[PDB]
Amino acid sequence: EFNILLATDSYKVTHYKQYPPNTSKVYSYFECREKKKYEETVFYGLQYILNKYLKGKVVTKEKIQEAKDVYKEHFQDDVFNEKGWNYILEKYDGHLPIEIKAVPEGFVIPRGNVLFTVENTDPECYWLTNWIETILVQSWYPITVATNSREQKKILAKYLLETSGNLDGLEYKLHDFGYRGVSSQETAGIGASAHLVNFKRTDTVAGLALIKKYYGTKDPVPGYSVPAAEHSTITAWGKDHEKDAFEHIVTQFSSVPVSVVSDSYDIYNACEKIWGEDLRHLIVSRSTQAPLIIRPDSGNPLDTVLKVLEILGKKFPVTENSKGYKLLPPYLRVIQGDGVDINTLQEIVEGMKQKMWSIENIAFGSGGGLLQKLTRDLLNCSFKCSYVVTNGLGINVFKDPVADPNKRSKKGRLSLHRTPAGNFVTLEEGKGDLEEYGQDLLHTVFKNGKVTKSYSFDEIRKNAQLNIELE
Amino acid sequence: EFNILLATDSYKVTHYKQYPPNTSKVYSYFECREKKYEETVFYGLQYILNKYLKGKVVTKEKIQEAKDVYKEHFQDDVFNEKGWNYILEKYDGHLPIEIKAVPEGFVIPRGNVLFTVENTDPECYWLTNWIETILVQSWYPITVATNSREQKKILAKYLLETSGNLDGLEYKLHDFGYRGVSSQETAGIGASAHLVNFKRTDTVAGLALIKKYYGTKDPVPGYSVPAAEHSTITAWGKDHEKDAFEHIVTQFSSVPVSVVSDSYDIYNACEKIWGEDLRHLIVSRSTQAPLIIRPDSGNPLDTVLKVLEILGKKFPVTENSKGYKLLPPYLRVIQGDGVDINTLQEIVEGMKQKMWSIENIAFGSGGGLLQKLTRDLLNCSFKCSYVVTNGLGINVFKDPVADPNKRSKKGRLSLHRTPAGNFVTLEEGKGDLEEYGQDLLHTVFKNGKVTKSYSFDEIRKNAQLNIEL
Ligand SMILES: O=C(/C=C/c1cccnc1)NCCCCC1CCN(C(=O)c2ccccc2)CC1
Ligand SMILES: O=C(/C=C/c1cccnc1)NCCCCC1CCN(C(=O)c2ccccc2)CC1
């Protein structure tokens, strides 16, 4: 069973001996710190952490003793605030005397703004605010996946609008293939859920149960999949029987969309001769609601996409749409799901545009790039103390390292506001109290062991919409 | 609760309908495919077998849940309810799978078979690749362990060169990665992988994983040290940094303590606060309880070098037997910002050029150690190599025309020692020719049971550096 006393950076066990004596309040905040582009971030995932790990009776006698026993050996020393944890157990029935205020989930906020704040609600528990830094900072991951996924949606929207005149099907154009490429089962659920903030297609099934339990949707499920082959279901037929494999698979899935990985031996042969000639009659007969989707999976991603489109365009009836771009027949599409990240996605769609191929023709799968190849420094997600009360006097505190101004933190009590022009601003030094800037956009989401304000996944999706979708 | 029927890539739900009719066996293998990182540490499969694959993993309720979810997820009924029911009824929900693997902690060159998977009941031909997704997640502990060991090699080389020995090596790279990983579960897994090579970690989650799944003779596999963070310095107020420092070193007067010193001005902190105002509180400390000064910003090499130059003029420096400079034993440095395998190399080489012993310093690494890694780094990959259809075995493989690096191995595989004592993987069942001695893979899982396992102490032994041995 999870033990919050064993869920912090080891050194934090020692911090109750380090704060100034007579400190009754430690107040800290989280931001995606600005860096001298990812200019705005999607706030998502705190609600998961609050419910799974922080709410309710999280301290017990047994948990205190287990931590005491572990830390004794881990430090080869007795440092450990047994009395402080005892206090929470006795006085609050093991509920954390902490108040957390946050911007609503799904909100899209520029870099360098306060996203949430954390403070103790009992003077005895001044040490607790930063104890939970470690667990709360892991919110970096769903924030960063959701943000990077949204930035890819923006690229897709731009090019789809340019080459087709509308955004039909945008939400299906980036498909999560990342389950095997993430570091754990828990990470898979969290990351998949964050991608679904922006899109509707995923093979990372773990995201579904996460969303159902912690957020919820009106619809039965938040994400969808489609039948598809893997190399094993092709190669198992034998090298001389690739066509037999293709024929069997498209016939098994004759009335639903089906993707068939076509690069086991020679992608270009498969497109030109197997799909384009030998099995063409099984493809041109298909429904618009049940296309064949050809899936390359190797080679230079742009070069391969372009050559695949070139081959198909000569074997199948191509039209030119109202924008002047080439369009495959509706029973045939392509998905590129190898080596796709935000940079290569851009290169591919721009390449297609230059060769006059509509983005209607293609969708993308992304695995490692979408869910794993991300770190906490991408958006500089960071948690810092900005205000303490010592001997009954509040003081505004901060770091400001001489050699790195980018690491300077904010001072004092903070609030987030709309500007007169409709943008965002973070007020420092308790200045929000002057009420010159309308209401604080941070809301209490956690107080004294209870989750006080929750968002459905539908609300989050609405909050994270692109401007172009709004238009 | 975990449900293995909902723990695969969605498209694999549809694969039972795509294999050749009358297929009775699907046999697959995992390798770190050949294309830096010439050899990999095999670690973490045992965690997966015990936590997710062993025992009764199918129930009626689990089957109904998955059926209900997939109906909505596909907007269609494609789920193999019959196949999962067969496992439940015939085997009391235990997986009819056999997995063979190299021993954990083993250090093996790229492009070798590390484990194999096959069904033990013809009805369950589809099950081999159902569990691809979970098993392939072993990439992460393999990669963390491997990259951590590569850093130990660097530290070993330079500590040996600058000091003449390896004393303390296992304390020189400290895991700071807990906040920087993607989840609690990842934290435990990755921290445990670093502990294959080192003994210091602030990622507490790894201790419990190791105790539950591997075990050590010692009470715990990893250790920590008291240390400040910016909040315990800055809370004192900007004009009271000296007060914070004094309080902290006085509270921790008889144990090692690290104190982050760059809140406002690292160079001032070192030269004036530690080097002058509080010097008397440092030179009185025990060799068993040094002050460790922690910079945390600026260019990592430049800042380490300047910090060392400052301390060397404020404190008595000696020259060790190798000709390198050494701080007094009550004073050390830890650099824990921006450290990855590349910057680690740059720092120690820069220290060596300026005649500073590696004895003076340790490294903390967070995102670099536990998060900034992908499955592409070692090309960790699972592929089918052998099938039996209509009673005939067939060697199968992929070999994409545009990328020879993605070519996979053919047929039944085995791992052997060569005459020179190296590893070789034999394909096409050739291990059965008995020209290369015994298969080095062992059966680790069979029909719901873990059949062979390793303590964390043995894993550490297997993962030792040549220089250590
Ligand atoms: O190939 C796999 C999964 C592979 C996988 C999974 C997991 C791990 N590793 C690999 N899944 C098949 C997805 C095919 C979906 C198609 C794409 C083309 N398409 C559009 O572009 C579109 C047309 C009209 C409107 C909107 C979009 C129509 C829908
Ligand atoms: O500063 C932190 C943690 C900060 C943190 C944690 C978590 C997250 N984010 C930040 N931990 C302090 C560790 C200090 C250990 C010292 C290093 C110097 N040293 C040697 O080099 C050595 C000398 C002789 C023999 C062997 C080694 C002696 C041991």
Residue numbers in the entry:
A (entry chain A): 8 to 43, 53 to 487
B (entry chain B): 8 to 42, 53 to 486
Q: Could you pull the original sentences from the published paper?
A:
NAMPT functions as a homo-dimeric enzyme that catalyzes the rate limiting step in the primary salvage pathway for NAD synthesis, the transfer of a phosphoribosyl residue from 5-phosphoribosyl-1-pyrophosphate (PRPP) to nicotinamide (NAM) to produce nicotinamide mononucleotide (NMN). Crystal structures of NAMPT in numerous ligand-bound forms have been reported. These structures consistently display a NAMPT homo-dimer with two essentially identical active sites at the dimer interface.
We conclude that these additional structural changes render the G217R mutation more deleterious for NAMPT inhibitor binding across structural classes.
